[PDB]
Amino acid sequence: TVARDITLLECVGKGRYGEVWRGSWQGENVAVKIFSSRDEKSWFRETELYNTVMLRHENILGFIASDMTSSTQLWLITHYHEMGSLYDYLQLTTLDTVSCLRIVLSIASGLAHLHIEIFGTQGKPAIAHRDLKSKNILVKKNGQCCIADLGLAVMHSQSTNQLDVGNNPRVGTKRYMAPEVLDETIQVDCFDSYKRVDIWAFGLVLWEVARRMVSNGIVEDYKPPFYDVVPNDPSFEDMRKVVCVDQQRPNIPNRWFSDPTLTSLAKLMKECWYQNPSARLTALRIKKTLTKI
Ligand SMILES: CCOC1(c2ccc(-c3cc4c(N5CCN(C(=O)C6CC6)CC5)ccnn4c3)nc2)CCN(C(C)C)CC1
Numbered sequence: 001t002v003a004r005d006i007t008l009l010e011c012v013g014k015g016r017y018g019e020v021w022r023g024s025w026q027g028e029n030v031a032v033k034i035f036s037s038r039d040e041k042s043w044f045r046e047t048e049l050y051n052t053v054m055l056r057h058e059n060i061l062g063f064i065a066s067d068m069t070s071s072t073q074l075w076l077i078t079h080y081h082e083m084g085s086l087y088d089y090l091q092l093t094t095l096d097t098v099s100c101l102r103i104v105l106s107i108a109s110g111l112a113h114l115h116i117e118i119f120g121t122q123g124k125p126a127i128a129h130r131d132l133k134s135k136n137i138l139v140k141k142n143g144q145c146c147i148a149d150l151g152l153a154v155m156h157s158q159s160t161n162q163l164d165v166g167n168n169p170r171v172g173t174k175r176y177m178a179p180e181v182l183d184e185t186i187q188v189d190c191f192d193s194y195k196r197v198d199i200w201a202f203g204l205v206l207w208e209v210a211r212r213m214v215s216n217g218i219v220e221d222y223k224p225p226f227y228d229v230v231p232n233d234p235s236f237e238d239m240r241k242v243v244c245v246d247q248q249r250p251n252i253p254n255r256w257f258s259d260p261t262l263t264s265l266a267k268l269m270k271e272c273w274y275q276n277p278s279a280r281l282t283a284l285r286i287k288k289t290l291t292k293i
Contacts, residue, residue, distance in 0.1 A: 003067040003075050006032060012084065017042070022080060029080035030064060034073050041168045042151025043074040049150050053124055059110030061138060061148040078148070086145060086205070087134040090212050091222045097261050099143050100213035104206055104265065105290040106144035107137060111202060112283040114147070115195050117158055125164075126156040128194030131172040132201040134208050134224070156191035163191050174239050175226060176201045179275050182240040186277075196277035202286070203272025206265060207250045215259035225250050249273050264293050 006023040013020035018036035022029055035043040047066040049055065056062070062079035069075055083089050086103070095103070117126040129150065136149035152172065155164040165188075172181065178200035180186035180193070187193045204225040211220040229248055230238045242248045249270070256262035268289060271281045281289075 002065040002077055003032075003069040006030060006077070008032065022082075023077075025064070025077070029082070031078045031080040033076045033078070035076070039151070039170060040074055041166070042149075042170055043076060045153065045166045045168060046076055046149075046151045049127075049153055049155075053127070053155070054122070055124065055127075057110060057113045059106045059144060059146045060113065061146045081138040081140055081146070083139040083141065085135050086137045086139055086209070089139045090134065090208065093212075094219045095209070095213040097213065097259075100209060100265075101261065101290065101293060102143045103139070103145055103209055105287065107147065107202065107205065108283060108287040108290055110145070110147045111198060112287045114153075115198070115283045117156070126158070126191060126195075128154050128156075128191065129198050129201075130154060130194055131170075131176070132198055132205065133173050133176050134205055137205065154191070154194050163189065172197070172201075174236050175224060175230070175234055176204055177236075177239055177243075178277070179244050180277055182236065183244045193277065195283070196280050199272045199280045199283065199286075200277075202283070203269040204250065206269040206272070210256070210262055210265045210269070211253070213259075213262060215255060215262060218255045220253060244275075247275065261293055264289075 002025060006025045008021045008023045010022045011019055012022050016036060017039045019034045021032040021034065023032045024030070050063040050066065064077040064079070067075045067077070111129070114127040114129060118124045129147065130152040131149065132147065137145050137147055139145055152166065152168060152170060154166065156162065178197045181197060186197070207225060212222060226242060229242050252266045256266050268281070268286060274280050
């Protein structure tokens with residue numbers, strides 16, 4: 001019924017996943033993500049998650065409804081953030097210390113919230129995202145972010161030791177894939193493995209953002225991770241060669257060591273990028289560290 005009352009106004013995004021539209025519902029802007037045929041299973045997983053797990057959180061994209069509307073389409077209706085994604089926003093502006101730390105702390109807060117199981121009737125299972133990237137993190141006008149696109153999410157309950165992986169043909173974006181995914185050594189039956197996959201990807205987003213924080217009048221152009229060492233649309237084997245075989249990691253600009261904030265974020269992101277997954281920081285530790293900077 002939400003879908004029948006929505007007026008679609010403007011397409012604001014298009015990809016292999018489908019399309020995103022700005023719509024109006026009860027006079028308020030809403031985001032309508034219209035899934036492609038190729039990605040119907042992500043719609044299904046996200047719908048199941050939003051209808052069975054209490055997820056609401058400042059830094060998780062707000063859910064309104066899911067619907068199959070009648071031509072038949074699969075729609076996921078959420079709050080609308082006119083700044084669009086971090087990918088979009090980082091390309092039209094540079095950041096200062098305050099706005100950079102607000103972005104990265106808000107992502108760490110949302111990720112910690114996903115990862116941590118909460119006991120009881122007001123609680124939730126532990127959740128790992130598995131495809132975190134700058135294109136599915138939204139920026140609010142108040143400068144905080146929120147994480148979207150839970151179609152690959154996996155859940156875990158420590159009490160019963162049940163791991164719910166989805167059976168989704170989709171895999172994570174290859175440019176952001178962790179070493180253990182690329183060399184197929186990931187322990188697929190351990191929930192902690194998916195959390196560590198998230199932490200790797202977070203480190204890459206951290207790098208993407210920090211580059212855009214000005215210090216002493218200097219800033220880097222926006223670039224996606226590994227822009228300098230793999231082609232656009234890199235293959236799985238392109239990524240395995242660079243990340244696993246050659247052990248490359250995004251370069252830290254020297255100008256960052258003149259700013260205390262960027263020096264601290266540089267230390268943080270390198271501790272997300274250990275080849276050994278169990279050596280990476282946890283989301284909560286990142287959150288704590290960023291609350292102190
Ligand atoms: C008319 C263009 O306008 C700009 C723009 C771009 C996007 C949005 C926008 C996207 C979303 C959203 N999505 C659904 C959840 N996601 C995913 O699943 C990603 C695919 C994996 C993220 C996208 C949800 C909620 N809100 N939302 C707003 N809004 C505005 C594009 C560029 N311009 C420039 C020209 C100035 C500015 C804004």
